[PDB]
Design a protein around this ligand. Structure first.
Ligand SMILES: COc1cc([C@@H](C(=O)N2CCCC[C@H]2C(=O)OCc2cnn(C)c2)C2CCCCC2)cc(OC)c1OC
Length: 128
């Protein structure tokens, strides 16, 4: 399914080239502009453990998920990944534990050493 496709075909968008954050563009966005650190960003997303034991959606409250980019308000893989996206874009990310919740995890919700998968739609981004 979606996670395996990203494993075998996804682009490694880490600085370190450690395959910690892999990305496939599923729908192309508008213009050339991607968000800057500190930009207010607006998304819709679905996410899951790659196990599939826990699943999560902004769609399951009909209201976009909003955060300031590059401030570590979200896991590192999102600050990396959403920074590569254009307004209108839909992307898939597959994320190793080092760029998500690590060896500590986030119990009881996220186990130790969990791999995560997200589908993300970048709706909009606005300056600080
Ligand atoms: C551990 O707590 C939670 C985790 C999650 C889900 C998750 O991992 N994310 C949610 C969207 C942004 C990326 C990432 C994250 O940075 O989340 C921490 C967080 C949430 N709100 N803010 C501002 C930052 C998980 C959920 C299980 C399936 C895999 C993704 C969502 C949470 O609540 C909606 C959450 O509780 C706070």
């Amino acid at each position: 399914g979606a996670p395996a496709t990203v494993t075998e075909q996804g682009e490694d968008i880490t600085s370190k080239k450690d395959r910690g954050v892999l990305k496939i563009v599923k729908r192309v966005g508008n213009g050339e502009e991607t968000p800057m650190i500190g930009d207010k960003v607006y998304v819709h997303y679905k996410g899951k453990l790659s196990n599939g034991k826990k699943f999560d959606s902004s769609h399951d409250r009909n209201e976009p998920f909003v955060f300031s980019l590059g401030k570590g308000q979200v896991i590192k893989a999102w600050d990396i990944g959403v920074a590569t996206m254009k307004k209108g874009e839909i992307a898939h990310l597959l994320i190793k534990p080092e760029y998500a919740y690590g060896s500590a995890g986030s119990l009881p919700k996220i186990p130790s050493n969990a791999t995560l998968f997200f589908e993300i739609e970048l709706l909009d981004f606005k300056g600080e």
